[PDB]
């Protein structure tokens, strides 16, 4: 089941719908894909078969 959403996830008593920074965080975070890294941070293209 895929899930695409950009809604802010709240982690406090106060509700978050369009405010973030103090206790609510953006759900997406980007990979820092660089070739200067070693083995455990390289981008691996993974394809599945079901």
């Amino acid at each position, epitope marked *: 089941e895929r899930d695409i959403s*950009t809604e*802010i996830y709240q982690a406090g008593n106060k509700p978050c719908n*369009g*405010v*973030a*920074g*103090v206790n609510c965080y*953006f759900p*997406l975070q*980007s990979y820092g894909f660089r070739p200067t890294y070693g083995v455990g941070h390289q981008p691996y293209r993974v394809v599945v078969l079901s």
Partner: antibody, heavy 126, light 109 residues
Framework: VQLVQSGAEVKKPGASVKVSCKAS????????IHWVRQAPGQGLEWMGW????????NYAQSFQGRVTMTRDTSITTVYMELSSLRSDDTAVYFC????????????????????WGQGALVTVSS | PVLTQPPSASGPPGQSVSISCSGS????????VYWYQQLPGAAPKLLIY???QRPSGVPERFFGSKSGTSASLAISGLRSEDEVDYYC???????????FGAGTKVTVL
């Protein structure tokens, strides 16, 4: 590194003007570029971005058919074309390079213009 | 869309002055906001990225942070470099691209 660009001069309205930006030193297959203009009496304005390793093209919400992008990978230059120049467009166009790489619409949250280049003032008067 | 900025903010040397940059619900509060300054007759550079840190070659006196839907920038020490203008760069989804403020002019008493 240096990000020198070539300017133009005054011209009649409604024609086409050619400005180019040249890149050197760094490899021109990993960094996106951004094009911003700065007019006297107002702040900076954004138009769009392209990719040197792909044919990605994005436009602003106000400039959809007025401006078109052109890429030259082998020459390592980028060519900007402005069509149907108005009266309130006398600005300084800056060739700005951003670190990282983005192609999706939502990718642009982490983009900052790190290495700027010197701008040139262009005007359109008949 | 665009962001509201004060046309002119000034402060005497020896202390710090604050520059505010407000925003809407989809301008600041869901995306990062960046601070840009430019010398007169030159190119802009980078001061603040990801709202907390600075690049190399930047003194530690330049600090900025945000709490809610607005961000503030504080500068301490105004002798020759803080007379330049500042810009409030952010990102949104309505214009589908980078948006900039009107511009803040900083002087000294």
């Amino acid at each position: 590194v240096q990000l020198v660009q070539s300017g133009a001069e005054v011209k009649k309205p409604g024609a086409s003007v050619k400005v180019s930006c040249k890149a050197s030193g760094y490899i021109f297959s990993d960094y996106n570029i951004h094009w911003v203009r700065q007019a006297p009496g107002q702040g900076l304005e954004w138009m769009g971005w392209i990719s040197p390793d792909s044919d990605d093209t994005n436009y602003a919400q106000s400039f959809q058919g007025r401006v078109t992008m052109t890429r030259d990978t082998s020459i390592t230059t980028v060519y900007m074309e402005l069509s149907s120049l108005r009266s309130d467009d006398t600005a300084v166009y800056f060739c700005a390079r951003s670190v990282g790489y983005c192609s999706l619409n939502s990718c642009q949250r982490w983009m900052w213009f790190d290495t700027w280049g010197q701008g040139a003032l262009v005007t359109v008067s008949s | 869309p665009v962001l509201t900025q004060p046309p002119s903010a000034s402060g005497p040397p020896g202390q710090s002055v604050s520059i505010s940059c407000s925003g809407s619900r989809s301008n600041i509060g869901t995306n990062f906001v960046y601070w840009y300054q430019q010398l007169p007759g030159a190119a802009p550079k980078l001061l603040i990225y990801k709202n907390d840190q600075r690049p190399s070659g930047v003194p530690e006196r330049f600090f900025g942070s945000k709490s809610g839907t607005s961000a503030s920038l504080a500068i301490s020490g105004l002798r020759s470099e803080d007379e330049v203008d500042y810009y409030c760069a952010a990102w949104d989804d309505s214009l589908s691209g980078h948006v900039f403020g009107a511009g803040t002019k900083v002087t000294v008493l």
